[PDB]
Scaffold this active site. Structure first.
Site, mmCIF file in Angstrom:
data_model
loop_
_atom_site.group_PDB
_atom_site.id
_atom_site.type_symbol
_atom_site.label_atom_id
_atom_site.label_comp_id
_atom_site.label_asym_id
_atom_site.label_seq_id
_atom_site.Cartn_x
_atom_site.Cartn_y
_atom_site.Cartn_z
ATOM 1 N N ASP A 1 148.956 54.128 79.185
ATOM 2 C CA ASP A 1 150.419 54.140 79.004
ATOM 3 C C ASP A 1 150.790 52.665 79.206
ATOM 4 O O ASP A 1 150.132 51.964 79.945
ATOM 5 C CB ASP A 1 151.006 55.027 80.123
ATOM 6 C CG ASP A 1 152.498 55.332 79.967
ATOM 7 O OD1 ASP A 1 153.119 55.055 78.917
ATOM 8 O OD2 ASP A 1 153.103 55.886 80.918
ATOM 9 N N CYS B 1 138.459 82.869 81.799
ATOM 10 C CA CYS B 1 138.168 81.464 81.925
ATOM 11 C C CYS B 1 136.694 81.219 82.198
ATOM 12 O O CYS B 1 136.113 81.872 83.066
ATOM 13 C CB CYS B 1 138.994 80.847 83.043
ATOM 14 S SG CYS B 1 138.736 79.067 83.361
ATOM 15 N N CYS C 1 136.021 79.752 88.282
ATOM 16 C CA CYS C 1 136.127 81.168 87.988
ATOM 17 C C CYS C 1 134.766 81.849 87.928
ATOM 18 O O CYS C 1 134.672 83.067 87.938
ATOM 19 C CB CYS C 1 136.872 81.381 86.678
ATOM 20 S SG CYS C 1 138.556 80.766 86.764
ATOM 21 N N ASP D 1 149.444 64.663 76.814
ATOM 22 C CA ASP D 1 149.063 64.236 78.160
ATOM 23 C C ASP D 1 150.146 64.852 79.048
ATOM 24 O O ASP D 1 151.248 65.098 78.579
ATOM 25 C CB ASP D 1 149.037 62.696 78.270
ATOM 26 C CG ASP D 1 150.418 62.091 78.475
ATOM 27 O OD1 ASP D 1 151.152 61.840 77.499
ATOM 28 O OD2 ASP D 1 150.763 61.880 79.642
ATOM 29 N N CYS E 1 135.375 78.318 83.376
ATOM 30 C CA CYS E 1 135.140 77.169 84.247
ATOM 31 C C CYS E 1 134.331 77.578 85.479
ATOM 32 O O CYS E 1 134.334 78.747 85.859
ATOM 33 C CB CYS E 1 136.465 76.510 84.665
ATOM 34 S SG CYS E 1 137.236 77.254 86.146
ATOM 35 N N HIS F 1 140.105 74.197 87.675
ATOM 36 C CA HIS F 1 140.395 75.348 86.847
ATOM 37 C C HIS F 1 141.508 75.018 85.866
ATOM 38 O O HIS F 1 141.363 75.301 84.672
ATOM 39 C CB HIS F 1 140.811 76.599 87.666
ATOM 40 C CG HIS F 1 141.636 77.578 86.878
ATOM 41 N ND1 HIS F 1 141.083 78.446 85.966
ATOM 42 C CD2 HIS F 1 142.974 77.780 86.811
ATOM 43 C CE1 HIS F 1 142.043 79.128 85.347
ATOM 44 N NE2 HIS F 1 143.202 78.739 85.848
HETATM 45 ZN ZN ZN Z 1 138.720 78.828 85.609
#
Ligand code: ZN
EC number: 2.4.2.29
Length: 372
Positions: free
Chosen positions: A92, A308, A313, A270, A310, A339
């Site tokens: 930025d 999910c 999880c 973003d 990830c 997450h």
């Molecule tokens: Zn997750």
């Protein structure tokens, strides 16, 4: 391998999916970029950020210029080497923070003078100083320096601010072009302004295209106008930008904002929301956000989200995370942030896949129906 190359692989309505090839890596679009404020994506190791699917992160020129200092980072070998992130970084230009976090800001045609909000006053920011700092940090995508237009804004107010920024865009373009190392390895994005006025937005787009940039960001949104206005502005604004160049919507990030923005032609996003709301106890799920601190999650053995993929999880329960956040444990922020960023990236992958398959419209509809 190239310095900058954007290719659109598929389209559906105004939406498109493709990639941006840069020397440090490929960026799949639509893309979400996690925010790295002080040379760190809050509570995450760079490898974890990459593990969630991110191809690029965003660094800010304001904070870094204050601490530890642009020059110091350059001396240390650059931002990439400094923080341990070897893929592309979009910086930025610092214009919006200079006006949001600085004390006694002084606007002028040359730039803005301000007092650092923490220790005296690392003071001056102009189009050429901004580009210089961004070069020092070693960013791959450099944002031209701009003057911010609050919301609401009167036509004359928005006009004069847009005009100043267009002049600053020219100065930024030239500054960037004078530095050969930068001009040869980095990309430069121009930022459209104009508030909610399409004539102003049009003028801004035309000025921007005249100068010529590698990508075009839509500035001035998500500053209080609300989703309806934002979307209305995007409807006439994005079509004003060059179709063959990426369109970046700064600071936009609620899941529904992203989906609607992509439907209007946006390729890059973003937002501090996923990281920020993570420390706060809010986790994103396909069924809307949940605040993990709520007593009903105290003995919930299910993961933050049932679909999910990830690492959080796959390994921890709502019950544990609920406990961690209520206890103010660092691991709590770590797990929630991972997450959330993971969720954002999965949403972008779902968006990119549905556009490639010509079923984005249905994805968007189904997404909204379930999320809300
Ligand atoms: Zn997750």
């Amino acid at each position: 391998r190239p310095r900058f190359s954007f290719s659109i692989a598929a389209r559906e309505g105004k939406a498109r999916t493709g990639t941006i090839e840069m020397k440090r890596g490929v960026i799949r679009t639509p893309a979400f970029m996690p925010v790295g404020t002080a040379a760190t994506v809050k509570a995450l190791k760079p490898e974890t950020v990459r593990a969630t699917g991110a191809d690029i992160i965003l660094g800010n020129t304001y904070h870094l210029m204050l601490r530890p200092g642009a020059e110091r980072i350059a001396k240390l070998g650059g931002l990439h080497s400094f923080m341990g992130w070897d893929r592309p970084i979009l910086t930025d230009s610092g214009g919006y923070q200079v006006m949001s976090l600085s004390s006694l800001t002084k606007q002028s045609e040359e730039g803005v003078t301000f007092k650092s909000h923490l220790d005296g006053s690392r003071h001056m920011l102009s189009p050429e100083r901004s580009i210089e700092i961004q070069h020092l940090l070693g960013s791959d995508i450099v944002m031209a320096f701009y003057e911010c237009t609050p919301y609401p804004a009167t036509p004359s107010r928005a006009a004069s601010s847009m005009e100043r920024s267009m002049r600053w865009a020219k100065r930024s373009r030239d500054a960037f072009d004078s530095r050969k190392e930068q001009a040869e390895n980095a990309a430069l994005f121009g930022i459209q302004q104009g508030s909610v006025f399409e004539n102003l937005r049009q003028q801004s787009a035309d000025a921007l295209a005249e100068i010529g940039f590698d990508g075009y960001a839509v500035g001035g949104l998500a500053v209080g106008e609300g989703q309806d206005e934002m979307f209305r502005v995007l409807d006439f604004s994005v079509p004003m930008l060059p179709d063959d160049k990426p369109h970046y919507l700064m600071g936009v990030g609620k899941p529904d904002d992203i989906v609607g923005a992509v439907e209007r032609g946006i390729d890059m996003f973003d937002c501090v929301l996923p990281t920020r709301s993570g420390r706060n106890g809010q986790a994103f799920t396909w069924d809307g956000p949940i605040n993990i601190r709520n007593a009903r999650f105290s003995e919930d053995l299910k993961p933050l989200d049932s679909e999910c993929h990830c690492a959080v999880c796959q390994k921890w329960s709502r019950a544990y995370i609920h406990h961690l956040i209520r206890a103010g444990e660092i691991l709590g922020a770590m797990l929630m942030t991972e997450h959330n960023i993971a969720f954002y990236q999965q949403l972008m992958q779902k968006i990119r896949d549905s556009i490639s398959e010509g079923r984005f419209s249905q994805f968007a509809q189904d997404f909204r129906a379930r999320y809300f």
